[PDB]
Design a protein around this nucleic acid. Structure first.
Lengths: 120, 147, 127
RNA sequence: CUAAGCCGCCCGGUGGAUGGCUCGGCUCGGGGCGCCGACGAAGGGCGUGGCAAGCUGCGAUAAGCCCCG
RNA sequence: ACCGAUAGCGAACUAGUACCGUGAGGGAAAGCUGAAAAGCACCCCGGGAGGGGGGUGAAAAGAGCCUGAAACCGGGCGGCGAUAGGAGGGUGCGGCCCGAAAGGAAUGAGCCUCCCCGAAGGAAACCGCGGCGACGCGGGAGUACGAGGGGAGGGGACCGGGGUUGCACCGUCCGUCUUGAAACACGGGGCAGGGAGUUCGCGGCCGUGGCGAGGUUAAGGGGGUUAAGCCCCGUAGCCGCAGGGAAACCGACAUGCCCGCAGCCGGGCUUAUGCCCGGUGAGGGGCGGGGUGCGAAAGCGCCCGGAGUCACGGCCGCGAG
RNA sequence: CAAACUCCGAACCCACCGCCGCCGUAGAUGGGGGGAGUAGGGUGGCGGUGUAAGCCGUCCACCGAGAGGGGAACAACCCAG
RNA sequence: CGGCCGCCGAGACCCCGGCGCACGGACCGAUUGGUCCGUGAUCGGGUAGGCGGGCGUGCCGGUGGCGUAGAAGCCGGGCC
């Protein structure tokens, strides 16, 4: 059956802006994140602070094309950008010393997206 | 949020509604038996389906003790003991009472299993323990007391 | 304007050559002759369904007008249905033509026509 | 200036579709109210209007009689 | 967020009435003038029913009364019409007829004349030669012409469209089972209305949205309100968080390794996208290790490194007509 | 002389390798999920059977589910999708 | 019967203009949408059946309107 795509106008605008930014800066990170975001809602990626702790490094930038959940513990200092955060997840990210930002803020801080790691 | 129309509205005008020949879709004979009919006991129309998709459909298995006599034992993991140790402070399940940290697991869970890791030392007052759970706690530094 | 005129002529020729698509046996019964329509023949032995030579043709995607001039009035303007002076006010005289709705009375038609003529707007039914 | 006959438009007859209307139906959470009869019930027959056939209402006091508001 | 007189109760009305059967019992059809009857005074004719004048009314809406369709019938008008054959039609045009509006058009139609470019394709006169012959080869020549694309002048009202019919060619109706339908196979006098994947329960999926190691309330309670809408609470319960076993019962990776797609980093070719190589690599795959059942053991089955739950819509499965 | 014989024995078919050709990063091969319909086939060549018609299989070419141009019309034949 | 020389003849093949579909790309619109460009000899018949878009009808919550200077309905005709 047809994939109608996200119903959220904010998410659709974010996807369009992501593709435009990729074209502007001549990279592939943002287009990759865009086609990952437009995944079917029954397959959207959700990641846990446990996985972030397992595979991240201090002072590193992570992009989650989906949701970040707060099951486990985080001990690294990391800057994570994701579509949505749970209350526990964001609290743990902040208490670990990192920051929980949005994809728009991630682009604004790092237009070229150098050193950013995708997690699903 | 996504709303659509039923397939009948599109099928209006197809003369069969996607059921094949006009002679199909009649009744019990079309279904080959009403309900679970013909699953193998007396008639074997759906025996081929039974022997693959629903094994053990026909037959008996062991017994089961009455629900009354069965005893229920709540079980927790040392991974949870550490992960949710902060929450127990609010409800008082854990407290300081001196230098050490005392957690009474008698109001939730009875036996402690040994899956995960222990990070901070503590004393848990439980009634049952697992070999790996007690080994993990002793290695970490805490203690296991059989309250 | 060169391509616009060429495609307008192409559409005129195409829609003059196109037939009137009517269901099978429309002429045979009053119930169908009084209410002309096209219905797809779905019979197992329907000659029109088989598309035999010597039988009425069926609509196809190839009969569509060129995209640039599709849906335009034969005069070349874009039709806009208008029900009042305020609606007429939001029109482009250079490219669009106002068609007064069949339901508006002559009293309001008078002001609609006056406003159109003082704004230099083409009206397809000026009465 | 074609006899019969066929197609198309106009007018006319036949017919009662369509549109509009609606004191009638149907379904409902909540609310009200729920028995009558030997002190003769329900149901029915027959009568009753100046002209009165049906329905409705009444009962030889018969589309009615009396009293307090 | 029910139907709107073939609908909705069988009954919108003198309907459980008329009427059918000995009886048990069965059971219809049928709404509408107009603001006001102002419901047609008087005159001619007819045996009468009625007809024609003349009145009323914004309008006969004239009681056979709102609107007044289709089938059918009578008349008028346009076309055909007694030597002509095919399911009643298709393609192309020619007679005769209608063409105010909504289509083009005097800011110029049909039409006539002239000039330029031109795809695929493509002659002939004339001259030379080959063949017994039909004919062919070389020059003419890729010339004349060619779908269509442009420009200029003349004239001054039709072109588009419609009804019928004429000619040339083609065309054996519609729905259906069937290998096979024009069928000497079944269903098909005409018109108008009505008419056939609906509701609940459970289960599998998908499209989207909320929360997320948690998700969600049911019965019910409080506030407010014209109201059943609206706001808040309500943890009982259900599913998930730990699997294995008939049961007793026991009770696990918050990563120890190897490959590796996307992505990121360094280098080279490359105008740029792009290509190759090397590293790291979420997700994904292969090992290792662990829990439990059977086993003397080996070893096997299932499971273990956290994603579920609720809601709206849709497809299907089983039971109810 | 041999379908129920073989001292011999093709055309041909099958499995695997290397290469050419073709497809594939605009995502193939492959894997998981949702929904079906189909359990009467016919003509045409070949094999067994039958006097023949026919009956039963095999080949996937055409009709079934396929226009247009022809064989006078023709389901299957020829050109052609 | 053995050969040859011209011509006629399809929706096939070639060319011009147009439509849609498949794939990739760039832009705008506050939900399934819209415009344009590029490739197609290797896209365009179709029964059972699968998927996508669109047309039409009654009622409701909104939004913008029409009508006694004439609504719905009905007969004939023009345009898309």
């Amino acid at each position: 059956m047809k994939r109608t795509g996200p119903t959220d106008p904010n998410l659709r605008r974010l996807i369009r802006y992501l593709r435009k930014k990729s074209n502007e800066y001549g990279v592939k990170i943002w287009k990759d994140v865009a086609w990952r975001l437009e995944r079917p809602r029954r397959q959207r990626a959700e990641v846990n602070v446990s996985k972030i702790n397992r595979y991240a490094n201090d002072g590193e930038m992570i992009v989650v094309p989906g949701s970040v959940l707060g099951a486990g513990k985080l001990e690294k200092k990391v800057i994570v950008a994701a579509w949505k955060f749970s209350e526990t997840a964001r609290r743990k990210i902040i208490e670990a010393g990192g920051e929980a930002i949005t994809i728009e803020e991630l682009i604004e801080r790092n237009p070229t997206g150098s050193g950013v790691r995708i997690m699903e | 949020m996504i709303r659509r129309r039923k397939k009948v509205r599109k099928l209006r005008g197809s003369h069969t509604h996607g059921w094949g020949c006009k002679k199909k879709h009649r009744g019990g004979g079309s279904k080959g038996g009403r309900g679970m009919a013909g699953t193998g006991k007396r008639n074997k129309s759906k025996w081929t389906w039974t022997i693959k998709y629903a094994p053990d459909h026909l037959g008996k298995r062991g017994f089961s003790r009455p629900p009354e006599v069965q005893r229920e034992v709540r079980v927790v993991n040392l991974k949870f003991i550490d992960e949710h140790l902060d929450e127990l402070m609010q409800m008082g399940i854990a407290y300081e009472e001196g230098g050490k940290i005392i957690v009474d697991v008698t109001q939730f869970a009875d036996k402690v299993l040994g899956t995960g890791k222990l990070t901070r030392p503590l004393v848990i007052k439980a009634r049952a323990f697992s070999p790996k759970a007690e080994e993990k706690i002793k290695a970490a530094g805490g203690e296991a007391v059989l309250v | 304007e060169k391509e616009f005129k060429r495609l307008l002529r192409v559409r005129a020729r195409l829609k003059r050559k196109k037939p009137r698509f009517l269901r099978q046996e429309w002429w045979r019964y009053p119930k169908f002759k009084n209410d002309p329509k096209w219905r797809r023949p779905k019979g197992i032995d329907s000659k029109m369904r088989l598309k035999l030579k010597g039988k009425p043709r069926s609509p196809s995607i190839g009969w569509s007008s060129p995209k640039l001039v599709r849906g335009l009035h034969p005069s070349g303007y874009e039709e806009v249905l208008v029900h009042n002076v305020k609606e007429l006010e939001a029109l482009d005289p250079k490219r669009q033509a106002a068609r007064i709705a069949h339901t508006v009375g002559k009293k309001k038609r008078i002001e609609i026509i006056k406003r159109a003529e003082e704004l230099g707007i083409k009206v397809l039914n000026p009465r």
